[PDB]
Structure 1
Amino acid sequence: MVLYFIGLGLYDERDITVKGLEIAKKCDYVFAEFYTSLMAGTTLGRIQKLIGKEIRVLSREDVELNFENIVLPLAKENDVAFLTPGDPLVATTHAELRIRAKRAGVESYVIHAPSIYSAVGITGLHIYKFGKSATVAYPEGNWFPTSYYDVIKENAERGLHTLLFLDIKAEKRMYMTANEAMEMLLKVEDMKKGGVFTDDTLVVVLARAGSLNPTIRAGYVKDLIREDFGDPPHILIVPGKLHIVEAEYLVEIAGAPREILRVNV
């Protein structure tokens, strides 16, 4: 009679919470999706081994089109878990799944876990100063998306930080690097010419948040665009004007150049 939306956290199998693991262990059926994001520091086998339950992986279509014909039916006479990377209900379309549950006369509960939305706090940037968030999407055909560029503009204009998710191709396991994102932004800048993202723009790159050894780097685009940030996934952040405390952190912890203490504060 119960559906549990359980988050898996950031990087590996140990990023699930104690509450999440215990609840998952008591469930008769355990489902999961890995198309919204991937746990790059682990594998399906390691997650299954930690939970002690076989995990049935669902595709994007399984969820968005058939959640009610695949997951909810079993939840009527059993305790069912639906696992997702990060924090449940963060992916835009997931909240709607709770409505589907209600409509089916199924109780659902949410077991939280760390999300990149909060983990980016490790960059030293104040959370309250983050503005609207966006995704740098992979272009294609006659479609050249530039929305994320206006998001940066509108945020930075108000002294706000911009969190940029990088596009991902789940199955093809193709991750967009911070370098690729920077390249695209430089190209959109060439068109819009709004003076929003240039070789002199300060940016922060966070890679493998959740691991014990994340890569946190900060610097001007002209110096970081070709820097190697390690294995994915990467997250790009274009900070608004910095509070001196944020800057000192970026310098001492993320290796930022002293220059930002005078230029970006």
Structure 2
Amino acid sequence: MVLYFIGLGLYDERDITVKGLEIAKKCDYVFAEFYTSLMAGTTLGRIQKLIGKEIRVLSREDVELNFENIVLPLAKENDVAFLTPGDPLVATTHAELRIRAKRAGVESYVIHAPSIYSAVGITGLHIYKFGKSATVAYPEGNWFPTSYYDVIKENAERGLHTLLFLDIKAEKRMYMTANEAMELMLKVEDMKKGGVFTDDTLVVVLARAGSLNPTIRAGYVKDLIREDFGDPPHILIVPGKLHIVEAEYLVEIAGAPREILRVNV
């Protein structure tokens, strides 16, 4: 009578950990959600085939409003697994679901999986140098989100890198590209005029981490804003002051302009 939160990883069904797979194969019921992120390299069918179980996919409403009515009941008498893209607790509100499990007298366990939060290391940017993170959300009607602007500002001032999660509207199959993120951000800069994010700002784009050939690009906004980085998901990063070896990596591996090698210490 336990509930397992099992992450599926970054790109395809093989990004699940061996631990996660062996446990998932032995659960009586398997649920999952695919709205918190996009696993561009697999399909529900492939996942099901891999674990050898039928997977009942849940919507944001099913989870957020009815988790304790749909999932928890079965966990009281069976072994249940709840699958999610990446790591189940990273940049989601899934952690709170563990509190619901407890209140319903259901023991829960967490099986991690590779997350975009650590995969940023493939950009060559020292991970310990990342500051507060943020999300670039799509404007809705008259509401235009801007919180991410001050986060970048705050981190840049301290010389820290900023990781920017990009928006996703799964039910509409909408996945924000780095290009769309940059356009929205330039519009905010136009309004705030803080010099935080401009055409001369160096940025890094990581697309489809987890795949064997992810797209890793670094350069100035003016040059990258219209570049094609391939299919989603995309993640955007605004570096802070660079170490010599970070700049070297960005140039040698991410195709950045050789001029970023010259750091302004």
Give the TM-score, by structure 1 length.
0.98
Shift of 1:123: 0.3
Q: Secondary structure at the match of 2:152?
A: helix
Whole-angstrom CA distance in 1 between matches of 2:92 and 2:230: 28
Look up the SS of the partner of 1:263 in the other structure: coil
Equivalent position SS for 2:171: coil
**Is 2:7–2:85's contact at 8 Å kept on the other side of the alignment?**
yes
Give CA deviations for 1:5-36 in whole Å, capped at 9, x if unaligned: 00000000100000000000000000000111
User: Aligned-pair distance for 1:215?
Assistant: 0.3
CA deviations over 1:65-106 (Å, ceiling 9, x no partner):
111111111001110000010012113311110010111111
1:145-165 deviations in whole A, cap 9, x for unaligned?
A: 111111100011100000001
Are the structure 2 counterparts of residues 47 and 264 from structure 1 closer, same or farther at C-alpha, using a change threshold of 3 Å?
farther
Quote the Cα distance in structure 2 between the aligned partners of 1:59 and 1:179.
27
The equivalent of 2:59 in structure 1 is 59
CA distance in 1, matches of 2:223, 2:209: 22
Looking at structure 2, the residues matched to 104 and 91 of structure 1 have their Cα atoms a distance apart, in angstroms, of 24
The Cα of 1:264 is off from its aligned counterpart by 5.8
Distance 1:105 1:197, change over 3 A: same
Q: SS where residue 187 of structure 2 aligns?
A: helix
Percentage of matched positions with identical amino acids: 99
**How many angstroms does 1:58 deviate by?**
0.5
Q: Are the counterparts in 1 of residues 38 and 232 from structure 2 also a CA contact under 8 Å? A: no
Deviation per CA, 1:214-242, whole angstroms, max 9, x where unpaired?
00000011111111101111100000010
Write out aligned runs for 1:115-130 (5 A): 115-130=115-130
Which sits farther off after the overlay, 89-98 or 205-214? Answer: 89-98
Give structure 1 stretches of 5+ with no counterpart: none
Shift in alpha-carbon separation, 1:264–1:203, aligned structure 2, 3 A: farther
Q: Which aligned runs of 4 or more in structure 1 are off by greater than 6 angstroms?
A: none
Map 1:141-220 → 2, pairs under 5 A: 141-220=141-220
Deviations 1:231-257 (A, max 9, x none): 111100000010111110001111111
Q: Secondary structure of the equivalent of 1:189?
A: helix
For residues 123-170 of structure 1, the C-alpha deviation after alignment (integer angstroms, 9 at most, x for no partner) is 000111001111100002221111111110001110000000111111
Is the contact between residue 207 and residue 233 of structure 2 (CA under 8 Å) also seen in structure 1?
yes
- Structure 2 equivalent of residue 111 of structure 1: 111
- What TM-score, normalized by structure 2, do the two folds share? 0.98
Distance 1:20 1:66 in 2: 24
2:99 partner SS: helix
In 1, Cα distance between equivalents of 2:243 and 2:263: 12
- Distance in 2 of aligned mates of 1:264 and 1:107: 53
Q: Are 2:244 and 2:263, in contact at CA under 8 Å, matched by a contact in 1? A: no
Change (3 A) 1:38 1:264: farther
Worse-matched range after superposition: 134-143 or 111-120: 134-143
Aligned length: 265
Deviation at 1:263, TM superposition (A): 4.6
Deviation of residue 183 (structure 1)?
Answer: 0.8
Unaligned runs of 5+ in 2: none
Indicate the RMSD between aligned Cα atoms, in angstroms: 0.9
